[PDB]
Amino acid sequence: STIEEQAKTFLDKFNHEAEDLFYQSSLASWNYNTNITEENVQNMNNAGDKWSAFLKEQSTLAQMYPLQEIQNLTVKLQLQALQQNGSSVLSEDKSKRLNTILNTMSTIYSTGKVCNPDNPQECLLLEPGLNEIMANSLDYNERLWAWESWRSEVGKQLRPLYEEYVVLKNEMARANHYEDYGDYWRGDYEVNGVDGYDYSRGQLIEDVEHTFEEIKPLYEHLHAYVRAKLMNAYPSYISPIGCLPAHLLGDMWGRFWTNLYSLTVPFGQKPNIDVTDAMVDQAWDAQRIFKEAEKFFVSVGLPNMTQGFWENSMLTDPGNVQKAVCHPTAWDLGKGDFRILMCTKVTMDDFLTAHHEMGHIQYDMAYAAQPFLLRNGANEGFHEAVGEIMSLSAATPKHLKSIGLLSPDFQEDNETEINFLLKQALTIVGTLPFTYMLEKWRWMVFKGEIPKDQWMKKWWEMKREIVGVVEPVPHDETYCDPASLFHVSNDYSFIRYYTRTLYQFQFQEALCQAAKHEGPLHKCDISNSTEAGQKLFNMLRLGKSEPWTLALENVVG
Amino acid sequence: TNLCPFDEVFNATRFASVYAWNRKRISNCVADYSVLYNFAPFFAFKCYGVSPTKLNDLCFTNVYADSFVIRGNEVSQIAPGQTGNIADYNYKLPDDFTGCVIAWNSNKLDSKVGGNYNYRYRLFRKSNLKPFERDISTEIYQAGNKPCNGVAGVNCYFPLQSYGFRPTYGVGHQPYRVVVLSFELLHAPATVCGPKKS
Ligand SMILES: *[C@@H]1O[C@H](CO)[C@@H](O[C@@H]2O[C@H](CO)[C@@H](O)[C@H](O)[C@H]2NC(C)=O)[C@H](O)[C@H]1NC(C)=O
Ligand SMILES: *[C@@H]1O[C@H](CO)[C@@H](O[C@@H]2O[C@H](CO)[C@@H](O)[C@H](O)[C@H]2NC(C)=O)[C@H](O)[C@H]1NC(C)=O
Ligand SMILES: *[C@@H]1O[C@H](CO)[C@@H](O[C@@H]2O[C@H](CO)[C@@H](O)[C@H](O)[C@H]2NC(C)=O)[C@H](O)[C@H]1NC(C)=O
Ligand SMILES: *[C@@H]1O[C@H](CO)[C@@H](O[C@@H]2O[C@H](CO)[C@@H](O)[C@H](O)[C@H]2NC(C)=O)[C@H](O)[C@H]1NC(C)=O
Ligand SMILES: *[C@@H]1O[C@H](CO)[C@@H](O[C@@H]2O[C@H](CO)[C@@H](O)[C@H](O)[C@H]2NC(C)=O)[C@H](O)[C@H]1NC(C)=O
Numbered sequence: 001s002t003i004e005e006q007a008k009t010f011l012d013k014f015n016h017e018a019e020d021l022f023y024q025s026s027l028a029s030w031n032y033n034t035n036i037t038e039e040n041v042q043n044m045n046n047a048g049d050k051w052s053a054f055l056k057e058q059s060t061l062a063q064m065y066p067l068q069e070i071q072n073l074t075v076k077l078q079l080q081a082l083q084q085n086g087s088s089v090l091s092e093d094k095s096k097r098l099n100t101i102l103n104t105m106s107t108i109y110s111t112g113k114v115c116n117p118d119n120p121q122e123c124l125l126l127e128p129g130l131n132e133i134m135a136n137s138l139d140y141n142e143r144l145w146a147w148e149s150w151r152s153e154v155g156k157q158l159r160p161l162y163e164e165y166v167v168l169k170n171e172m173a174r175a176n177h178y179e180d181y182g183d184y185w186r187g188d189y190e191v192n193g194v195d196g197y198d199y200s201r202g203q204l205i206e207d208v209e210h211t212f213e214e215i216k217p218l219y220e221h222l223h224a225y226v227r228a229k230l231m232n233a234y235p236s237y238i239s240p241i242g243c244l245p246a247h248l249l250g251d252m253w254g255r256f257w258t259n260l261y262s263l264t265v266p267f268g269q270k271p272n273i274d275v276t277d278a279m280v281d282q283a284w285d286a287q288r289i290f291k292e293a294e295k296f297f298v299s300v301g302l303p304n305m306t307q308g309f310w311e312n313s314m315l316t317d318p319g320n321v322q323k324a325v326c327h328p329t330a331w332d333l334g335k336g337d338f339r340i341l342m343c344t345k346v347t348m349d350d351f352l353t354a355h356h357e358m359g360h361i362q363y364d365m366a367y368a369a370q371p372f373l374l375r376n377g378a379n380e381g382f383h384e385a386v387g388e389i390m391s392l393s394a395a396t397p398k399h400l401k402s403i404g405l406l407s408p409d410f411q412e413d414n415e416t417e418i419n420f421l422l423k424q425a426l427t428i429v430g431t432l433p434f435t436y437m438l439e440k441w442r443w444m445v446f447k448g449e450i451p452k453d454q455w456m457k458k459w460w461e462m463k464r465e466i467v468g469v470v471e472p473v474p475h476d477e478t479y480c481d482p483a484s485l486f487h488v489s490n491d492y493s494f495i496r497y498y499t500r501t502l503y504q505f506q507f508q509e510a511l512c513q514a515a516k517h518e519g520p521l522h523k524c525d526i527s528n529s530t531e532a533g534q535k536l537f538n539m540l541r542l543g544k545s546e547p548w549t550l551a552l553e554n555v556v557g
Numbered sequence: 558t559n560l561c562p563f564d565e566v567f568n569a570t571r572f573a574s575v576y577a578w579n580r581k582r583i584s585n586c587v588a589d590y591s592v593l594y595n596f597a598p599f600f601a602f603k604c605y606g607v608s609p610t611k612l613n614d615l616c617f618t619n620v621y622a623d624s625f626v627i628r629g630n631e632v633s634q635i636a637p638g639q640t641g642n643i644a645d646y647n648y649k650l651p652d653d654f655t656g657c658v659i660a661w662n663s664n665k666l667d668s669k670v671g672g673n674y675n676y677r678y679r680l681f682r683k684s685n686l687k688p689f690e691r692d693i694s695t696e697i698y699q700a701g702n703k704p705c706n707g708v709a710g711v712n713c714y715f716p717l718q719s720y721g722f723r724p725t726y727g728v729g730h731q732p733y734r735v736v737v738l739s740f741e742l743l744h745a746p747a748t749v750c751g752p753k754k755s
């Protein structure tokens with residue numbers, strides 16, 4: 001009865017209370033998301049603050065079992081997840097000041113407007129209308145106007161707010177023995193005391209910098225090919241040995257190159273695979289799509305859908321007036337209630353988004369036997385990786401012709417192979433130097449290695465050195481170009497997009513071996529292979545119980 | 558003939574919670590076994606003592622029908638030699654069990670949109686129950702070494718909690734009505750058992 005038994009009993013009480021409070025909160029949120037009314041918002045906020053206050057008071061109550069006296073790893077993990085002060089370690093003045101600038105930055109980003117230099121009554125927002133100019137146009141001057149004005153009219157408002165946000169966040173992180181915010185963020189990959197699977201918070205930086213050193217040989221060739229293909233769409237503006245101008249990359253920041261596909265398709269006269277026609281031709285519906293997804297999943301050895309999933313799920317868009325947020329997600333309310341919210345349309349894209357979502361759900365159905373605080377991916381990158389490999393495998397022609405959406409022969413050629421691999425590389429690879437660069441900047445800004453009179457200087461040095469793009473107009477220290485990105489201004493960790501890209505292929509390789517695949521990797525298909533399902537399940541069903549370095553070893557090796 | 562009041566114990570509109578479970582003893586009468594298959598939604602007709610070959614030819618001095626309501630995935634705990642909250646703090650079964658247990662889903666009845674907090678169960682106790690024991694006390698369970706003189710707080714909790722049954726729950730989280738028919742042959746020469754075919 002010394003210290004551990006009391007902790008265990010307290011954890012039992014918590015597991016049985018929070019499980020219900022969370023259900024109520026999430027159910028209210030779902031009902032609001034699927035049927036937008038006014039009172040729905042009130043019920044949602046009521047359930048929300050109800051849950052949040054309970055969590056806070058439980059936190060304050062749990063700060064009495066000292067972590068050094070616990071021996072079981074499970075209860076130690078739970079108590080450590082529960083004990084963290086997080087915010088509220090600041091003063092009240094300071095905490096209110098922080099919560100104010102967060103909302104100010106988010107609102108500036110969400111409702112900022114720029115407008116034409118000649119008809120100033122034509123102001124555009126970012127979302128419907130600026131990143132459409134940037135994504136569709138081919139006029140050098142129009143793209144340049146948009147790229148410059150967005151940063152000169154909105155980026156200049158975020159600078160005095162970001163300079164003040166850095167300080168508060170650093171104080172909040174130092175009050176919890178972390179030395180900066182960046183360490184607080186990296187504190188998600190940390191593992192302590194398993195004797196063979198440890199992981200320091202500083203080791204992540206070396207792992208990232210070493211894994212990036214082997215991609216430059218391929219990113220350089222891709223960059224050179226794209227640069228050579230752009231000197232025909234914007235002649236006289238691209239130097240054949242210099243960088244790329246930052247406004248010609250496809251979107252407002254350059255996070256994805258996937259819009260340069262039209263300009264740089266290798267063999268334009270070979271239309272890549274699409275079955276949008278053959279689906280409406282065979283009269284397919286949402287129900288058929290999701291039945292096929294469930295069939296593919298049970299094919300490898302994973303369970304069926306819970307059959308409550310078919311009734312509560314909102315698969316098709318409600319017609320008359322049932323205003324709903326169409327953004328496909330999977331919901332894990334709990335207690336055995338998993339649902340899907342998406343506004344499907346018979347297409348090829350939705351045929352893959354169905355597999356993505358059902359992958360998420362199959363992940364959630366696995367660790368549902370864990371304590372409430374240990375229901376999550378092994379770290380922040382596992383969930384979308386597991387979701388992604390499913391859509392990766394369910395788009396191969398070998399799978400489509402087996403479904404029936406293709407001609408039974410459909411002889412493929414080594415030209416569609418390249419047309420496909422390139423379209424993939426513009427999304428996967430084109431985004432790795434950007435990510436690694438951005439998160440390297442923030443880590444250095446929070447740490448203090450960049451005095452605040454040299455933020456833009458370092459930003460545009462690292463852009464030219466790592467990513468290989470150059471800005472078209474100089475930027476002094478009154479601008480703030482990183483703050484003009486969604487994740488930067490809304491305080492989201494950005495490294496989960498780097499690691500997720502790596503795991504997503506490691507898995508795909510290991511499973512590919514269990515299915516005894518022969519040819520190139522990009523034609524792998526794990527369907528009809530039960531050993532793949534078993535190797536996957538033995539990692540899925542863990543949750544956060546084990547350190548992520550063990551779950552990762554359970555599959556890759 | 559006088560029949561067992563099966564339909565009066567197998568169709569009670571409101572069942573008992575598990576910790577304070579209902580026990581009804583059936584006295585000397587005719588024991589019509591193969592009539593309980595009237596509705597038959599069922600979930601588990603397993604029997605330990607008497608196997609499904611002596612349904613009516615064998616007799617017992619008296620039988621006890623225990624009735625309550627639990628969650629789904631806990632029906633497995635209702636067995637001699639099981640461990641778990643229900644198997645220690647709400648009901649215990651002796652290893653020499655001669656009757657057998659019956660369960661069925663009842664989601665449409667005992668689940669109400671908004672929560673049905675009338676059913677509770679004990680999750681805290683100083684030691685495990687005894688076979689066929691029953692406890693109803695609501696003393697504040699003490700966890701720590703500091704006596705709490707009967708008030709909820711640190712290291713001392715109210716040893717009861719309730720299922721929030723709702724219709725939108727998966728199986729294993731839905732209400733399930735359970736009935737245990739325990740037999741008894743002490744010394745009676747003539748007692749209640751099945752009818753003979755005339
Ligand atoms: C979507 O929400 C609205 C408002 O919350 C619902 O409209 C009313 O809901 C109440 C709730 O019981 C009913 O009593 C009213 O009859 C409803 N009025 C109308 C005009 O529908 C609406 O029912 C919700 N959508 C669904 C599918 O339930
Ligand atoms: C403390 O750790 C032990 C093992 O280190 C856990 O024991 C497990 O308990 C579950 C049931 O709760 C069993 O199914 C496992 O087989 C046990 N593992 C072993 C290795 O025996 C124990 O559960 C932990 N404490 C708590 C409160 O869960
Ligand atoms: C969480 O924050 C509190 C302050 O709000 C930290 O300070 C301890 O708080 C407890 C509870 O009031 C006191 O009993 C201790 O004396 C405080 N000082 C200590 C422990 O040095 C607490 O340390 C923080 N905990 C964590 C894990 O960060
Ligand atoms: C696709 O495959 C074909 C056949 O394997 C390739 O065509 C041959 O390419 C080699 C490479 O120099 C030539 O020596 C041969 O003369 C070609 N064959 C014919 C019949 O012309 C083709 O190059 C491949 N293309 C891609 C993009 O992989
Ligand atoms: C997985 O295997 C099953 C059974 O081997 C396949 O189902 C049959 O596949 C053969 C081979 O093309 C067809 O002739 C039959 O018509 C199929 N019958 C049924 C009921 O499916 C299935 O096609 C395989 N799937 C994949 C993706 O390889």
Ligand SMILES: *[C@@H]1O[C@H](CO)[C@@H](O[C@@H]2O[C@H](CO)[C@@H](O)[C@H](O)[C@H]2NC(C)=O)[C@H](O)[C@H]1NC(C)=O
Pocket residue numbers: 564568595596
């Ligand atoms: C269990 O009890 C209920 C309630 O008395 C019975 O439901 C009755 O069913 C009959 C015919 O199905 C109806 O005419 C009555 O109106 C129902 N009663 C009520 C209150 O609605 C049910 O039939 C009983 N089950 C058995 C097996 O006898």
Ligand SMILES: *[C@@H]1O[C@H](CO)[C@@H](O)[C@H](O)[C@H]1NC(C)=O
Pocket residue numbers: 303304
């Ligand atoms: C899944 O559901 C189908 C019904 O279409 C059934 O035939 C099959 O046995 C089920 N499999 C599992 C594992 O539940």
Ligand SMILES: [Zn+2]
Pocket residue numbers: 356360383384387
């Ligand atoms: Zn996802």
